[PDB]
Amino acid sequence: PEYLSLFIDDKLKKGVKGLTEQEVETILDKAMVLFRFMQEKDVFERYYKQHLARRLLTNKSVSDDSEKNMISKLKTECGCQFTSKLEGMFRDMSISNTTMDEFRQHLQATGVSLGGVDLTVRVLTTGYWPTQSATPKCNIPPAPRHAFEIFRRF
């Protein structure tokens, strides 16, 4: 299941393998058919969520349309259960981008120092995204440090 998750992540990160949707749809159908005759769905869901975290917390423009196809296929294969957690994670991504819009509005208001130049700050919830280890700590840039401090004050 881990290798299947890696394969689906490789197919989802970019549509280089087949620009047209036809072959993408066929290969996704074949992948879900292969997943149908598979056990140990818990590790599959865990690794799929980890791949979602990796692909959403990095450069975007992954597909901006195939996420709906992926969630629909999950809802018709596993059903509202493990796919429900991924729906919650997508809702949390929406929350983060709305909070980023709010922080941009706050920077347009203050707009005085160089603390928040292009501070693209994402706000996530503990439950959806597991801790990397124990939230590491070390010296950070001071202008952006005061930017993060003002974001925390907001």
Partner 1 sequence: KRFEVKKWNAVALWAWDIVVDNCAICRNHIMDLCIECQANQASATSEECTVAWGVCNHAFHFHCISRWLKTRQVCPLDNREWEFQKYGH
Q: Point out which residues bind a second copy (CB under 8 A).
A: 105-112, 114, 116-118, 153-154
Q: Is 43 in the site for partner 1 (CB under 8 A)?
A: no
Q: Is 79 in the site for partner 1 (CB under 8 A)?
A: no
Q: Is 137 in the site for partner 1 (CB under 8 A)?
A: no
Q: Is 87 in the site for partner 1 (CB under 8 A)?
A: no
Our CB check for partner 1 shows the closer of 34 and 143 to be 143
Query: Could you tell me which of 97, 113, 101, 95 has the C-alpha nearest to residue 150?
Result: 113
Q: Is 129 in the site for partner 1 (CB under 8 A)?
A: yes
Q: Are the C-beta atoms of residues 63 and 95 closer than 8 Å to each other? A: no
Our CB check for partner 1 shows the closer of 76 and 97 to be 97
Q: Are the C-beta atoms of residues 82 and 1 closer than 8 Å to each other? A: no
Our CB check for partner 1 shows the closer of 32 and 53 to be 53
Q: Are the C-beta atoms of residues 66 and 17 closer than 8 Å to each other? A: no
Contact residues for 71 (Cβ-Cβ < 8 A; gap 6+): 83, 86, 87, 90
Our CB check for partner 1 shows the closer of 61 and 108 to be 61
